[PDB]
């Protein structure tokens, strides 16, 4: 009757206002990717419309999502970060 | 109004997370620190919890799932999860709701049950402990 909480995918969603450079900034600053990998993920967001940035516990995923969204808000970009059950 | 023992527990748990370079201080770091907070420990012993086992389960989970800040990263440091923040606010709310002010480790433990998607709440229920078991211990001992 008891199952562990599940893991969550943290996702970056595409939009037409947010600069590629800021998406890369976010991937490096909040997910620790190096420039190369961050750039690949930025392109994926651009083409697929969204991309998985990482998988974390529900608790950690929720916090990363809030942190990314606050940072986007602060810099006035509508960059949307979301989470989804893994 | 956190009592002295809880405050000490919270601050040392936080210092330990910072020494380990953990990006986040979780509700699991919190429950782990409460295992030796007198107030919360007494409640868990009253519920016949294998504290040695719970401790190991928490440490293993913390180690496998908590991101580690890189050496380079010297601009950001350990921060509490939203879940952790809610538990502390909830513990204060519950205590004030009864007209009191002193918040103990046991009240914090009670609040953990409300974070339904936390590994800590899951491990507590797995060790057959319910919110009401803890409230009963706080209200009536045994």
mmCIF file of C-alpha atoms in Angstrom:
data_model
loop_
_atom_site.group_PDB
_atom_site.id
_atom_site.type_symbol
_atom_site.label_atom_id
_atom_site.label_comp_id
_atom_site.label_asym_id
_atom_site.label_seq_id
_atom_site.Cartn_x
_atom_site.Cartn_y
_atom_site.Cartn_z
ATOM 1 C CA UNK A 1 0.000 0.000 0.000
ATOM 2 C CA UNK A 2 3.141 2.153 0.236
ATOM 3 C CA UNK A 3 5.304 3.222 -2.684
ATOM 4 C CA UNK A 4 8.187 5.768 -2.603
ATOM 5 C CA UNK A 5 7.480 9.193 -4.058
ATOM 6 C CA UNK A 6 8.552 9.125 -7.695
ATOM 7 C CA UNK A 7 11.344 10.859 -9.605
ATOM 8 C CA UNK A 8 10.650 13.895 -11.813
ATOM 9 C CA UNK A 9 11.864 15.167 -15.145
ATOM 10 C CA UNK A 10 12.744 18.853 -15.084
ATOM 11 C CA UNK A 11 11.922 20.501 -18.416
ATOM 12 C CA UNK A 12 12.727 23.733 -20.230
ATOM 13 C CA UNK A 13 9.993 24.948 -22.567
ATOM 14 C CA UNK A 14 10.571 26.977 -25.748
ATOM 15 C CA UNK A 15 9.240 30.503 -26.281
ATOM 16 C CA UNK A 16 9.989 33.215 -28.911
ATOM 17 C CA UNK A 17 11.274 35.916 -26.534
ATOM 18 C CA UNK A 18 14.110 34.252 -24.510
ATOM 19 C CA UNK A 19 17.639 34.523 -26.033
ATOM 20 C CA UNK A 20 19.583 31.306 -26.654
ATOM 21 C CA UNK A 21 22.331 32.776 -24.509
ATOM 22 C CA UNK A 22 19.998 32.991 -21.497
ATOM 23 C CA UNK A 23 18.800 29.397 -21.967
ATOM 24 C CA UNK A 24 22.491 28.392 -21.969
ATOM 25 C CA UNK A 25 23.102 30.570 -18.909
ATOM 26 C CA UNK A 26 20.298 28.760 -17.094
ATOM 27 C CA UNK A 27 21.548 25.282 -18.089
ATOM 28 C CA UNK A 28 25.043 26.035 -16.829
ATOM 29 C CA UNK A 29 24.032 27.905 -13.727
ATOM 30 C CA UNK A 30 21.232 25.619 -12.462
ATOM 31 C CA UNK A 31 22.148 22.246 -13.932
ATOM 32 C CA UNK A 32 25.919 22.420 -14.096
ATOM 33 C CA UNK A 33 26.271 21.598 -17.771
ATOM 34 C CA UNK A 34 29.460 22.753 -19.502
ATOM 35 C CA UNK A 35 29.047 25.134 -22.475
ATOM 36 C CA UNK A 36 29.051 22.328 -25.012
ATOM 37 C CA UNK A 37 26.284 20.227 -23.519
ATOM 38 C CA UNK A 38 24.238 23.285 -22.500
ATOM 39 C CA UNK A 39 24.343 24.387 -26.157
ATOM 40 C CA UNK A 40 23.073 21.012 -27.379
ATOM 41 C CA UNK A 41 20.145 21.223 -24.940
ATOM 42 C CA UNK A 42 19.341 24.805 -25.974
ATOM 43 C CA UNK A 43 19.100 23.626 -29.622
ATOM 44 C CA UNK A 44 16.853 20.750 -28.579
ATOM 45 C CA UNK A 45 14.518 23.160 -26.782
ATOM 46 C CA UNK A 46 14.482 25.343 -29.928
ATOM 47 C CA UNK A 47 13.656 22.435 -32.317
ATOM 48 C CA UNK A 48 11.581 20.007 -30.251
ATOM 49 C CA UNK A 49 9.815 22.780 -28.363
ATOM 50 C CA UNK A 50 11.094 21.473 -24.994
ATOM 51 C CA UNK A 51 13.796 19.281 -23.453
ATOM 52 C CA UNK A 52 14.545 17.350 -20.281
ATOM 53 C CA UNK A 53 17.277 19.029 -18.195
ATOM 54 C CA UNK A 54 17.561 16.401 -15.523
ATOM 55 C CA UNK A 55 15.788 13.885 -13.381
ATOM 56 C CA UNK A 56 15.530 14.436 -9.632
ATOM 57 C CA UNK A 57 13.502 13.461 -6.575
ATOM 58 C CA UNK A 58 10.134 15.232 -6.508
ATOM 59 C CA UNK A 59 11.422 17.461 -3.664
ATOM 60 C CA UNK A 60 14.598 18.535 -5.498
ATOM 61 C CA UNK A 61 12.785 18.896 -8.893
ATOM 62 C CA UNK A 62 10.211 21.247 -7.360
ATOM 63 C CA UNK A 63 12.985 23.466 -5.949
ATOM 64 C CA UNK A 64 15.015 23.611 -9.137
ATOM 65 C CA UNK A 65 11.886 24.509 -11.083
ATOM 66 C CA UNK A 66 11.114 27.409 -8.688
ATOM 67 C CA UNK A 67 14.716 28.615 -8.804
ATOM 68 C CA UNK A 68 14.826 28.637 -12.611
ATOM 69 C CA UNK A 69 11.480 30.403 -12.906
ATOM 70 C CA UNK A 70 12.465 33.079 -10.365
ATOM 71 C CA UNK A 71 15.705 33.660 -12.251
ATOM 72 C CA UNK A 72 13.841 33.990 -15.573
ATOM 73 C CA UNK A 73 11.331 36.379 -13.969
ATOM 74 C CA UNK A 74 14.138 38.495 -12.450
ATOM 75 C CA UNK A 75 15.756 38.862 -15.842
ATOM 76 C CA UNK A 76 12.374 39.504 -17.457
ATOM 77 C CA UNK A 77 12.247 36.512 -19.741
ATOM 78 C CA UNK A 78 9.194 34.287 -20.028
ATOM 79 C CA UNK A 79 11.435 31.170 -19.955
ATOM 80 C CA UNK A 80 9.184 28.455 -18.523
ATOM 81 C CA UNK A 81 10.598 25.548 -16.509
ATOM 82 C CA UNK A 82 8.260 22.669 -15.532
ATOM 83 C CA UNK A 83 8.399 19.181 -14.013
ATOM 84 C CA UNK A 84 6.742 15.914 -14.915
ATOM 85 C CA UNK A 85 6.629 12.455 -13.237
ATOM 86 C CA UNK A 86 9.571 10.455 -14.602
ATOM 87 C CA UNK B 1 9.659 30.304 18.165
ATOM 88 C CA UNK B 2 12.092 27.349 17.842
ATOM 89 C CA UNK B 3 13.410 26.014 21.143
ATOM 90 C CA UNK B 4 17.156 25.795 21.778
ATOM 91 C CA UNK B 5 17.501 22.085 20.981
ATOM 92 C CA UNK B 6 15.636 22.308 17.681
ATOM 93 C CA UNK B 7 17.639 25.401 16.666
ATOM 94 C CA UNK B 8 20.902 23.546 17.390
ATOM 95 C CA UNK B 9 19.664 20.549 15.337
ATOM 96 C CA UNK B 10 18.692 22.803 12.404
ATOM 97 C CA UNK B 11 21.961 24.757 12.433
ATOM 98 C CA UNK B 12 24.264 21.741 12.687
ATOM 99 C CA UNK B 13 22.328 19.848 9.968
ATOM 100 C CA UNK B 14 22.725 22.927 7.816
ATOM 101 C CA UNK B 15 26.445 23.207 8.585
ATOM 102 C CA UNK B 16 26.950 19.523 7.742
ATOM 103 C CA UNK B 17 25.130 19.864 4.451
ATOM 104 C CA UNK B 18 27.393 22.859 3.635
ATOM 105 C CA UNK B 19 30.540 20.917 4.525
ATOM 106 C CA UNK B 20 29.395 18.102 2.208
ATOM 107 C CA UNK B 21 28.736 20.692 -0.537
ATOM 108 C CA UNK B 22 25.110 19.608 -0.876
ATOM 109 C CA UNK B 23 23.154 21.909 -3.118
ATOM 110 C CA UNK B 24 20.107 21.437 -0.992
ATOM 111 C CA UNK B 25 19.167 20.952 2.575
ATOM 112 C CA UNK B 26 16.227 18.530 2.344
ATOM 113 C CA UNK B 27 13.457 17.284 4.548
ATOM 114 C CA UNK B 28 15.564 14.110 4.753
ATOM 115 C CA UNK B 29 18.575 16.007 6.106
ATOM 116 C CA UNK B 30 16.008 17.410 8.540
ATOM 117 C CA UNK B 31 14.571 14.067 9.696
ATOM 118 C CA UNK B 32 18.122 12.720 10.003
ATOM 119 C CA UNK B 33 19.088 15.567 12.324
ATOM 120 C CA UNK B 34 15.857 14.982 14.323
ATOM 121 C CA UNK B 35 16.917 11.382 15.073
ATOM 122 C CA UNK B 36 19.129 12.859 17.793
ATOM 123 C CA UNK B 37 16.919 15.801 18.742
ATOM 124 C CA UNK B 38 15.659 14.676 22.203
ATOM 125 C CA UNK B 39 12.027 15.753 21.629
ATOM 126 C CA UNK B 40 11.635 14.013 18.250
ATOM 127 C CA UNK B 41 13.786 10.992 19.276
ATOM 128 C CA UNK B 42 11.576 10.319 22.304
ATOM 129 C CA UNK B 43 8.515 10.300 20.080
ATOM 130 C CA UNK B 44 10.150 7.885 17.636
ATOM 131 C CA UNK B 45 11.280 5.556 20.421
ATOM 132 C CA UNK B 46 7.740 5.606 21.801
ATOM 133 C CA UNK B 47 6.717 4.345 18.358
ATOM 134 C CA UNK B 48 9.348 1.541 18.524
ATOM 135 C CA UNK B 49 11.294 2.789 15.549
ATOM 136 C CA UNK B 50 14.567 1.181 14.596
ATOM 137 C CA UNK B 51 16.533 4.409 14.637
ATOM 138 C CA UNK B 52 19.704 2.682 13.336
ATOM 139 C CA UNK B 53 17.877 1.489 10.249
ATOM 140 C CA UNK B 54 16.040 4.826 9.606
ATOM 141 C CA UNK B 55 19.320 6.624 9.946
ATOM 142 C CA UNK B 56 20.982 4.376 7.300
ATOM 143 C CA UNK B 57 18.022 4.627 4.931
ATOM 144 C CA UNK B 58 18.155 8.460 5.196
ATOM 145 C CA UNK B 59 21.909 8.731 4.721
ATOM 146 C CA UNK B 60 21.860 6.446 1.690
ATOM 147 C CA UNK B 61 18.977 8.388 0.100
ATOM 148 C CA UNK B 62 20.601 11.747 0.820
ATOM 149 C CA UNK B 63 23.874 10.562 -0.741
ATOM 150 C CA UNK B 64 22.264 9.073 -3.899
ATOM 151 C CA UNK B 65 19.860 11.915 -4.675
ATOM 152 C CA UNK B 66 21.267 15.210 -3.448
ATOM 153 C CA UNK B 67 23.189 17.113 -6.120
ATOM 154 C CA UNK B 68 26.662 18.235 -5.074
ATOM 155 C CA UNK B 69 27.835 21.803 -5.823
ATOM 156 C CA UNK B 70 30.982 21.921 -7.936
ATOM 157 C CA UNK B 71 34.208 23.492 -6.540
ATOM 158 C CA UNK B 72 33.925 26.145 -9.274
ATOM 159 C CA UNK B 73 30.490 27.135 -7.959
ATOM 160 C CA UNK B 74 31.495 29.593 -5.253
ATOM 161 C CA UNK B 75 28.654 32.061 -5.862
ATOM 162 C CA UNK B 76 25.783 29.806 -4.668
ATOM 163 C CA UNK B 77 25.682 27.618 -1.533
ATOM 164 C CA UNK B 78 23.372 25.098 0.149
ATOM 165 C CA UNK B 79 19.796 26.134 0.245
ATOM 166 C CA UNK B 80 16.659 24.586 1.744
ATOM 167 C CA UNK B 81 14.117 22.866 -0.460
ATOM 168 C CA UNK B 82 10.629 24.250 -0.680
ATOM 169 C CA UNK B 83 9.514 21.158 1.130
ATOM 170 C CA UNK B 84 11.898 21.928 4.019
ATOM 171 C CA UNK B 85 10.601 25.504 4.213
ATOM 172 C CA UNK B 86 7.012 24.370 4.318
ATOM 173 C CA UNK B 87 7.685 21.886 7.134
ATOM 174 C CA UNK B 88 9.204 24.546 9.395
ATOM 175 C CA UNK B 89 6.383 27.054 8.584
ATOM 176 C CA UNK B 90 3.839 24.276 9.161
ATOM 177 C CA UNK B 91 5.419 23.365 12.525
ATOM 178 C CA UNK B 92 5.215 26.993 13.629
ATOM 179 C CA UNK B 93 1.607 27.238 12.349
ATOM 180 C CA UNK B 94 0.475 24.110 14.157
ATOM 181 C CA UNK B 95 1.943 25.291 17.467
ATOM 182 C CA UNK B 96 0.518 28.798 17.188
ATOM 183 C CA UNK B 97 -2.824 27.241 16.193
ATOM 184 C CA UNK B 98 -3.042 25.826 19.644
ATOM 185 C CA UNK B 99 -2.209 29.223 21.160
ATOM 186 C CA UNK B 100 1.375 28.238 22.081
ATOM 187 C CA UNK B 101 4.802 29.416 20.895
ATOM 188 C CA UNK B 102 7.467 26.865 21.773
ATOM 189 C CA UNK B 103 8.319 24.758 18.696
ATOM 190 C CA UNK B 104 10.058 21.465 19.376
ATOM 191 C CA UNK B 105 11.639 18.726 17.239
ATOM 192 C CA UNK B 106 8.483 16.696 17.852
ATOM 193 C CA UNK B 107 6.257 19.416 16.346
ATOM 194 C CA UNK B 108 8.610 19.479 13.310
ATOM 195 C CA UNK B 109 8.296 15.709 12.971
ATOM 196 C CA UNK B 110 4.498 16.080 12.969
ATOM 197 C CA UNK B 111 4.756 18.620 10.136
ATOM 198 C CA UNK B 112 6.883 16.288 7.977
ATOM 199 C CA UNK B 113 3.837 14.044 7.369
ATOM 200 C CA UNK B 114 2.231 16.777 5.350
ATOM 201 C CA UNK B 115 4.982 16.633 2.699
ATOM 202 C CA UNK B 116 3.369 13.676 1.001
ATOM 203 C CA UNK B 117 5.903 13.347 -1.776
ATOM 204 C CA UNK B 118 8.958 13.475 0.491
ATOM 205 C CA UNK B 119 11.169 10.471 1.041
ATOM 206 C CA UNK B 120 11.093 11.348 4.778
ATOM 207 C CA UNK B 121 7.330 10.994 5.049
ATOM 208 C CA UNK B 122 7.549 7.748 3.063
ATOM 209 C CA UNK B 123 10.235 6.277 5.374
ATOM 210 C CA UNK B 124 8.268 7.288 8.466
ATOM 211 C CA UNK B 125 5.105 5.539 7.240
ATOM 212 C CA UNK B 126 7.252 2.609 6.154
ATOM 213 C CA UNK B 127 8.368 2.359 9.778
ATOM 214 C CA UNK B 128 4.659 2.272 10.661
ATOM 215 C CA UNK B 129 4.521 5.781 12.213
ATOM 216 C CA UNK B 130 1.543 8.109 11.532
ATOM 217 C CA UNK B 131 1.082 11.872 12.211
ATOM 218 C CA UNK B 132 -1.527 10.965 14.836
ATOM 219 C CA UNK B 133 0.895 8.568 16.603
ATOM 220 C CA UNK B 134 3.226 11.468 17.114
ATOM 221 C CA UNK B 135 0.457 13.894 18.181
ATOM 222 C CA UNK B 136 -0.766 11.270 20.684
ATOM 223 C CA UNK B 137 2.693 10.979 22.119
ATOM 224 C CA UNK B 138 3.033 14.743 22.406
ATOM 225 C CA UNK B 139 -0.435 15.039 24.015
ATOM 226 C CA UNK B 140 -0.526 11.955 26.197
ATOM 227 C CA UNK B 141 2.910 10.353 26.429
ATOM 228 C CA UNK B 142 3.000 6.522 26.806
#
